[PDB]
Ligand binder design. Structure first.
Ligand SMILES: CC(=O)N[C@H]1[C@@H](Oc2ccc([N+](=O)[O-])cc2)O[C@H](CO)[C@H](O)[C@@H]1O
Length: 898
């Protein structure tokens, strides 16, 4: 312990705290809610922590202390207030008890103590530990990719480069956590740590990092978006993926292995287009067998075994494919020549072919990306500069084999790679890097994938959902994983369920070559293939929405959102009651199927669907079925074709034509799927999709406003598309406009103003007239959000919509105002009417209680459960008070005895 504080002095650039031990700390005030506290036993007070190697020059911070300016520091006063020293600016009171040295921070806007040390910093055992008060309602997020976990109260998390990709490991640590009390802390260290959020003593949180230094950035903010924006201003805004990065990729090696003709039914046999069965061999496993060597371009009497042939199969199977890594395999390489330049020419010809097919090429790496002598490369070296400038590579994946050391290593590597992409293309290619073993800052260059796990089993989904959520809460919105795992497979239902929910996630990797079957969306039967295509096409149609929430995640909430981000006033949104669902942007609640529980009809039984907000209607995206929030639904029947996705009524979802890659998007069209519910709004972002020019303001935004009746009510609806602001290379100014307004009745009238001039709309007599014509509207009871899913599910999945089409117009010069009179979107709402119209001892397990007494509701520890279809209900996931009420046609009853 450094002892009592004897003095706090305002120096030229920071406040100097002198402890009775003679140890000093510097407080740097960066803005009115962010400060750095640096207790440096060495007295050097260097701006940056020591990395694990001096060549690791990429910094945690993206903004220097000097870049924040001196204003907040100038406007912070130190006062000697008897038993305390106080630092005070417009934002914070930082209060230090003189005798104990304990720091506490009053947020002056809240007039509440947000952070309070309860024991002094401890430097024992070559670690630096802070001990904080933990309050009963205080929750904690962050830590990076905390495999299986997102909400950390009552647990400890390891801030360690664990190189463990399965539940309970850490695929990508981050020394960043935040408290729902309204603070975030970045430990300014490259050293591993352990954050114990009151795992045995619930009133104490301890944060420990190895080392002899205590250096931390403390930021105070009253919103989760503000905490993340603080983290991003400090450590770097997330990179915005190029549009193609949101599309599934195919990853494997096509330069190294051999295919041997085998019998059908041979272990590992794969059928090819010649109608024969082949089994894949590494060259060293061939033994006396003879096979056909793979190549990227299939130029060697081997076309069906080539990387080109895989592009052709995704095309033949009409599957989206954004990008392709053809060298993803240990020692695989990307050419078979005697030179790097010969291999780069082979890869360039692959990239020409991939690009002719609308697919970008990335490379995997297990190594440094530069030759020992770039002017004289050796065969088998890497030269990301030539790979980029000569071969046209646009993306990079960093194997643990490269970045496995962790901490400063990965950040240095991905920073250097990002700079090469940009420099070699003069900014024509923005970075597209997928990494792991990250740290604070990684997000500004790279997204993460979660590493190697076994698919073909429900645990593959179950642990991934919270993993994504917690990754995103850690300031990494660009998260992905392998589609149905790198290992295993042979479980059709898991495969379909994985493609389903990852539609509503950023990055999808078909990590092929290691599994129980090929890793593609067409590896299973036609039922699975058509479902996977349907969900992949839905993602392609959602690209304007997805790109818009991606833009938001550059300086705001991430794309995968913990329930608490969108519903901060509900306790359920913070706990493991929210571990298996999330908001995909603001507008979609995704509650993936994550276990094999079923009925005899093969329907999955989904428990614990938490629908927030007693005042909010949630709309099944596929069927239009409506559900009242403020409840957790158990026993929800979910057919194989379906993933539980609910639209937040009010949602504007920008859409586009189904497409297999960004070059197939019609840039001369725009389309909005709207669920009007009072006054809502959406900001649609666009840019050139590929370059760094967005960072220099080459982008455009379009504000869409929907102003109509509340859910299920009738009224006037005004949809206003404000003029598009901004421009960029190959910006298309002249676009047609579609609105698909979910509606339950034909309107009284639909009128259209374009830049203040009326456009006469005709009522289409039928769908074919509507589809053929422009300046029309059409009330359609056969509206399909996803025709591929309708066809794949064997369900029509018809919904009712009022669709409106306007002719091409200048989107910059002229707005759109559509007025619908007699607008209504009414359906029956499950739990819509909350109007007031024993413990079964023999069934008590260790962790499940069964209560007995058109449906019922039960309150479990202050959380309301619904969809209880019979005369009993069991509650589990226990290591409790039960009230029950009846549900009928005309409302409910009041709470029975606790
Ligand atoms: C975490 C990581 O880098 N994963 C890579 C890596 O994966 C494996 C997979 C299996 C083993 N093993 O059986 O011991 C080791 C490493 O390299 C793969 C190369 O194809 C993939 O890139 C995978 O994502």
């Amino acid at each position: 312990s450094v002892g009592a504080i004897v003095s706090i002095e305002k120096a030229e650039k920071n406040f100097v705290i002198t402890y009775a031990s003679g140890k000093k700390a510097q407080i740097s005030i960066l803005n009115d809610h962010l400060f750095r506290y640096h207790l440096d036993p060495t007295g050097k007070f260097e701006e940056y922590p020591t990395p694990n190697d001096p060549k690791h020059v990429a910094k945690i911070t993206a903004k220097t202390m000097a870049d924040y300016g001196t204003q907040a520091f100038e406007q912070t006063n130190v006062t000697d207030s008897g038993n305390q020293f106080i630092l005070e600016n417009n934002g914070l009171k930082i209060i230090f008890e003189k005798e104990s040295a304990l720091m506490k921070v009053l947020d002056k806007k809240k007039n509440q103590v947000i952070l309070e040390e309860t024991a002094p910093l401890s430097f024992k055992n070559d670690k630096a530990t802070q001990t904080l008060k933990q309050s009963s309602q205080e929750n904690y997020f962050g830590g990076g990719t905390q495999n299986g976990r997102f909400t950390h109260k009552g647990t400890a998390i390891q801030i360690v480069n664990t190189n463990n990709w399965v539940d309970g490991g850490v695929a990508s640590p981050n020394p960043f956590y935040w408290s729902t009390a309204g603070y975030g802390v970045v430990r300014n260290t490259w050293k591993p740590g352990n954050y114990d959020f009151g795992s045995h003593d619930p009133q104490t949180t301890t944060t420990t990092h190895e080392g002899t230094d205590f250096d931390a950035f403390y930021f105070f903010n009253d919103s989760s978006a503000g905490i993340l924006k603080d983290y991003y201003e400090l450590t770097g805004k997330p990179a915005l993926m190029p549009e193609y990065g949101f599309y599934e990729a195919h990853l494997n090696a096509y330069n190294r292995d051999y295919w041997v003709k085998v019998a059908e039914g041979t272990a590992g046999a794969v059928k090819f287009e010649d109608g024969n069965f082949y089994k894949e061999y590494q060259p060293g496993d061939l033994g006396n067998l003879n096979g056909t060597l793979e190549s990227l371009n299939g130029e060697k009497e081997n076309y069906q075994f080539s990387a080109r042939a895989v592009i052709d199969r995704y095309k033949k199977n009409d599957m989206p494919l954004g990008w392709f890594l053809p060298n993803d395999g240990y020692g695989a390489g990307y050419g078979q020549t005697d030179s790097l330049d010969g291999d780069v020419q082979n890869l360039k010809e692959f990239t020409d072919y991939a690009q002719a097919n609308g697919v970008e090429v990335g490379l995997w790496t297990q190594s440094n990306l530069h030759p020992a002598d770039p002017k004289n490369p050796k065969k088998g070296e890497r030269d990301i500069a030539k790979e980029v400038s000569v071969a046209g590579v646009k993306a990079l994946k960093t194997a643990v084999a490269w970045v496995g050391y962790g901490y400063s290593f990965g950040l240095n590597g991905v920073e250097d790679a990002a700079n090469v992409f940009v420099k070699e293309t003069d900014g024509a290619v923005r970075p597209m890097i997928v990494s792991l073993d990250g740290w604070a800052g990684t997000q500004r260059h790279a997204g993460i994938w979660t590493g190697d796990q076994t698919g073909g089993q429900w645990e593959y989904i179950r642990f991934h959902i919270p993993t994504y959520i917690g990754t995103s809460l850690s300031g990494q919105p660009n998260v992905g994983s392998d589609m149905d795992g790198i290992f295993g497979g042979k479980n059709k239902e898991v495969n379909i369920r994985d493609f389903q929910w990852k539609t509503f996630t950023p990055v999808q990797l078909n990590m092929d070559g290691w599994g129980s079957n090929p890793k593609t969306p067409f590896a299973f039967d036609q039922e699975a293939t058509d479902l996977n295509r349907a969900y992949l096409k839905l993602k392609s149609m959602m690209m304007p929405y997805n790109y818009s929430i991606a833009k938001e995640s550059v300086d705001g909430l991430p794309m995968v959102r913990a329930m608490a981000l969108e519903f901060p006033n509900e306790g359920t949104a913070y706990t493991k009651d929210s571990q298996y669902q999330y908001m995909w942007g603001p507008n979609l609640l995704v509650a993936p199927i994550y276990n094999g529980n079923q009925d005899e009809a093969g329907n999955s039984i989904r428990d614990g669907i938490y629908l927030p907000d007693e005042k909010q209607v949630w709309v099944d995206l596929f069927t239009g079925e409506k559900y009242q929030g403020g409840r957790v639904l158990n026993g929800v029947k979910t057919p194989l074709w379906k993933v539980p996705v609910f639209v937040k009524d009010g949602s504007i979802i920008p859409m586009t034509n189904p497409n297999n890659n960004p070059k197939e998007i019609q840039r001369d069209q725009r389309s909005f799927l709207i669920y009007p519910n009072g006054a809502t709004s959406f900001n649609m972002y666009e840019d050139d999709g590929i370059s760094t020019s967005y960072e220099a303001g080459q982008s455009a935004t379009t504000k869409i406003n929907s102003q109509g009746p509340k859910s299920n009510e009738k009224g006037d609806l005004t949809v206003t598309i404000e003029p598009t602001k901004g421009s960029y290379k190959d910006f298309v100014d002249e676009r047609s406009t579609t609105l698909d307004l979910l509606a339950s009745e034909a309107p009284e009238s639909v009128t259209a103003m374009v830049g203040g001039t009326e456009v006469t709309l005709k009522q289409a007599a039928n769908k074919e007239e509507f589809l053929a014509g422009t300046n029309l509207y059409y009330f359609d009871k056969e509206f399909q959000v996803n025709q591929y899913l309708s066809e794949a599910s064997g369900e029509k999945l018809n919904q009712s919509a009022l669709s409106v089409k306007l002719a091409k117009q200048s989107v910059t010069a002229k707005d759109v105002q559509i007025t619908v009179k007699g607008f209504i979107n009414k359906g029956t709402v499950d739990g819509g009417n909350t109007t007031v119209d024993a413990i079964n001892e023999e069934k008590t397990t260790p962790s499940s209680l069964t209560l007995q007494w058109t449906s019922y509701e039960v309150e479990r520890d202050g959380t309301v459960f619904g969809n209880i279809q019979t005369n009993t209900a069991t509650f589990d996931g226990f290591s409790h008070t039960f009230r029950v009420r009846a549900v009928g046609k005309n409302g409910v009853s009041e709470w029975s005895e606790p």
